[PDB]
Amino acid sequence: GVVEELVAAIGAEQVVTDPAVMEGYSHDEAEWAPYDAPAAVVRPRDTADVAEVVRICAGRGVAVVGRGAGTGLSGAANAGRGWVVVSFERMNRVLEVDTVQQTVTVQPGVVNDDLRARVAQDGLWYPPDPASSPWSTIGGNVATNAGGLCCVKYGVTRDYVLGMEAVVGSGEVVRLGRTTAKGVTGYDLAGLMVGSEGTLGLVTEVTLRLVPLRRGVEHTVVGYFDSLTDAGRAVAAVSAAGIVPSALELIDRFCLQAVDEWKNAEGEVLLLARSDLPGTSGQEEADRILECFEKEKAVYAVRSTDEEEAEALFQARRLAYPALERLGPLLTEDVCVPKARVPHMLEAIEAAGERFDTRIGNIAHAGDGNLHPLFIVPAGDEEAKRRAKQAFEVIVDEALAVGGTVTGEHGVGLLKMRGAADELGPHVLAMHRAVKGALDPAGIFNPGKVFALE
Amino acid sequence: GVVEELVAAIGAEQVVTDPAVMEGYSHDEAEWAPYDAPAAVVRPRDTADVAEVVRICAGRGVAVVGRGAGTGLSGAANAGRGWVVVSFERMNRVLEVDTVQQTVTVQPGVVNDDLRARVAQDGLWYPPDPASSPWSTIGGNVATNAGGLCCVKYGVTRDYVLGMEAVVGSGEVVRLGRTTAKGVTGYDLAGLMVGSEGTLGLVTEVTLRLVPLRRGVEHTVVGYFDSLTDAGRAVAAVSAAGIVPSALELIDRFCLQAVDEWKNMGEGEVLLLARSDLGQEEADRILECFEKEKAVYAVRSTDEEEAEALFQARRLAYPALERLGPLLTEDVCVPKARVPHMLEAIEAAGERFDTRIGNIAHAGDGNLHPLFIVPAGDEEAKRRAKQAFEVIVDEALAVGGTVTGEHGVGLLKMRGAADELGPHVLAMHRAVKGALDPAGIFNPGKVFALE
Ligand SMILES: Cc1cc2nc3c(=O)[nH]c(=O)nc-3n(C[C@H](O)[C@H](O)[C@H](O)COP(=O)(O)OP(=O)(O)OC[C@H]3O[C@@H](n4cnc5c(N)ncnc54)[C@H](O)[C@@H]3O)c2cc1C
Ligand SMILES: Cc1cc2nc3c(=O)[nH]c(=O)nc-3n(C[C@H](O)[C@H](O)[C@H](O)COP(=O)(O)OP(=O)(O)OC[C@H]3O[C@@H](n4cnc5c(N)ncnc54)[C@H](O)[C@@H]3O)c2cc1C
Ligand SMILES: [Fe+3]
């Protein structure tokens, strides 16, 4: 009688059982991630509803997986058979914007882009800008510690989580973290929630840190290359010069030429960089970045004196994944290695394609060494699927061999549990099982993702 | 028979038992914090030695309390009777400075200022600059999540900790966190160590993120006031102008006197020292904010040296007051909008309890440091200050602040810490510590109670 207690606790408008409606609430954009039919999909109204849902599911031992917008790429939000999917679509209000403290308090259902537009009205700015910003929730960004494009100079979500309110344990609603500028009272439990991917609790309200709007001119330094190796050597060349570019992205040829077909290519690798320093200070730095592209392999390495053709190339970098998803199933990998390993990793990925006869596109946050190789899977050719799945295990192990990480921003979820286990090791994993057990003694919060419990 | 197992594990020259020597290892600069004679003070050489100390005490259930430079202000490093003090004095080497990744790898025993000067050679910079930087260890800065003067614009220690290696549990050497620029694999166990004050493990190596050197001329904006109330409104003026200053510090009268009566170098009640890191247009905007409020000799300083001399008194305020006797310090942090109100509350706590309370605070972040000098022989004033101590704290939580901003709960703040966190959150601390420290040997009893 799980659905019976839920309706009797939070009403009927907050429980859904139509197998047709629950279809889309149990899987995210991560393809090949298994997902089964959940027992019911709850859409709570406020923290009180979530507290009751967690309490009921805790006693009955029913797995509950929180869901934001369902734009994950590792199946972290995917629901298991009989689970209770908690959709925060109804908790989508920005509660306050304190201009003196320069902080904002939002609900987990808020959309990233919507949040940024609201704070910009008060002259503030929320730096984190994931490619899925137009559709991802702040709840998801906090659960997966999502990153963005400008995170090479302003950090990721974790760098802006001051405090939060979460439902944990048997249904206790607690307020973790702080709201002032400095606080060390107790443990960093608020930070412990960030990057947990909903395996330790449920965030019902988060307090974010803000910054003044950049109200300025973005000097773009555009560069083209003919090889992923040379272009990789240039990104490291700028980082060795000691420059902190406000953006440094790589878009191979296969990816950029596809976006044109959708929305309507000087070289093989397009290295897009940009700086945001005011006045000539930025122009001086943007010029320095240009030389780094020219000194290395340089094809059409020119600084952009146009505020739109620059912005048009960057809008293509954002529409790279959705432009290729319409082109068929797309398997994506997220590794992050040291900046000095970008050339070795780029040439190592390209080599991985020839060994398994699999064409692999490349886009990566060159500023942080976070590579995103994307493979478009042709339908009908199972060997290509199999060859790409084994190449999947080569790029991962190769990134761990140079000292990288199995995931940089997308989250372990399900499609990266193998690599995550090899990176963390038995001791680190054992600590995860212990931590999750103390804060989730019922084992109901998204059990089985990131790491396994046995 | 515990000391014997230790000596039989890490040699004799790494174990000390002389009760005359262990004194300097069993208590920190936090006075009135309880401390007893430890069973031995271990000075490890490498992670292997630290691993042995943890394994031995884990099986025997002997409490171990890690110690850095002993500059804590809440008794976090104070040792309990029969404990084993692990001193990282020997682990004080900078292991690597990766200029391509722009990161540094340090051991816990390294001093803050030493780490900064080291990275300065390679054109890098470590922003976090606590007042005790010249003699505090990086191991301590990570356990307490220390702050500094520039943290109003560059964050605190936790904002630069990329990864670490620690000995947890029964003595397993694990490396938490990452070393790249981005990493989200699993939980943030590294961030969990930060601010734990050594209650979940022992950090033997930390990987900190760095930034390019400033390489510019700072625009210092010095300002004088005649009261903590009027000056408080000036601090809000910079906040009401959308200005993020690289530094904003406030010092009281008795603080300045002690600095001029010690260093003998040198007029106002409070002195707000502002600074920008852009730039003259911003420094000028702040100057007008001071004259907008009660302004005495408010001038946007162009002499970078004379201003730099003024910032030496702000950092030498506590060392200049400890020479005048026992100094009990409180560390509250409230929202910026409560700085003026909170300052007026501190003054009343003095009049109400007949206690002279000096004030220095990072007004830019709302981190207040009211310090009382306790005279010798007048125990009445000591207990009277303890009552104003409970009043200034409750007023910090009532207005939405926190019991501790940068110093840490330790021991002299566990009362307020419990009131702030609450039963639910406290029950979580005992649960977390239990999972990662099933033996309960890592500084047990501090921060929260293991009742
Ligand atoms: C086209 C595209 C571009 C992308 N670009 C980026 C990018 O640039 N950077 C990046 O980091 N990621 C990117 N992603 C994936 C992205 O990380 C996720 O979309 C984003 O992190 C959040 O999406 P979401 O709102 O759907 O969260 P969801 O997928 O719903 O949830 C993700 C995780 O968070 C947990 N969770 C959700 N809500 C809550 C809550 N309220 N409380 C606690 N836990 C919760 C979920 O259970 C799951 O574990 C992209 C995805 C797509 C499809
Ligand atoms: C004069 C003065 C000025 C100060 N100014 C500031 C300031 O501006 N900002 C600020 O934030 N703080 C300040 N402090 C206190 C500051 O927190 C300490 O100076 C700093 O935290 C480190 O001191 P320490 O290295 O002696 O740490 P210790 O006191 O030795 O240790 C502090 C806590 O950390 C734990 N710990 C230490 N090393 C390890 C380790 N290797 N692994 C695990 N746990 C460990 C200790 O056990 C203890 O719990 C000041 C202190 C003084 C005395
Ligand atoms: Fe991305």
Residue numbers in the entry:
A (entry chain A): 3 to 266, 271 to 460
B (entry chain E): 3 to 268, 272 to 283, 288 to 460
Quote the study on this structure.
Here, we report the discovery and characterization of a new FAD-dependent D-lactate dehydrogenase (PdG-D-LDH) from the gut microbiome of the isopod Porcellio dilatatus. PdG-D-LDH exhibits a strong catalytic preference toward D-lactate and preferentially reduces quinones over cytochrome c or molecular oxygen. X-ray crystallography revealed a VAO/PCMH-like fold with a solvent-accessible active site that harbors both a FAD cofactor and an Fe(II) ion. PdG-D-LDH exhibits the characteristic VAO/PCMH structural fold.
The crystal structure of the enzyme was solved both in the absence or presence of D-lactate (PdG-D-LDH–lactate), revealing a Cα root-mean-square deviation (RMSD) of 0.46 Å between the two structures. Moreover, a metal ion and the substrate D-lactate (in PdG-D-LDH-lactate complex) are clearly defined in the electron density. In D-LDH, D-lactate binds Fe(II) and interacts with H416, which likely abstracts a proton from the C2-OH, enabling hydride transfer to FAD’s N5. The C1 group coordinates iron and forms salt bridges with R323, while the C3 group engages in hydrophobic interactions with Y327, I369, and L380. In PdG-D-LDH, the C2-OH is 4.6 Å from FAD’s N5—too distant for efficient catalysis—unlike m-D-LDH, where this distance is 3.1 Å. Thus, the PdG-D-LDH–substrate complex likely lacks a catalytically competent geometry. The substrate-binding site comprises two distinct regions: one predominantly positively charged, defined by R323, H371, H378, and H416, is located near the C1-carboxyl and C2-hydroxyl groups of D-lactate. The other, more hydrophobic, is primarily delimited by Y327, I369, and L380, facilitating a stronger interaction with the substrate.
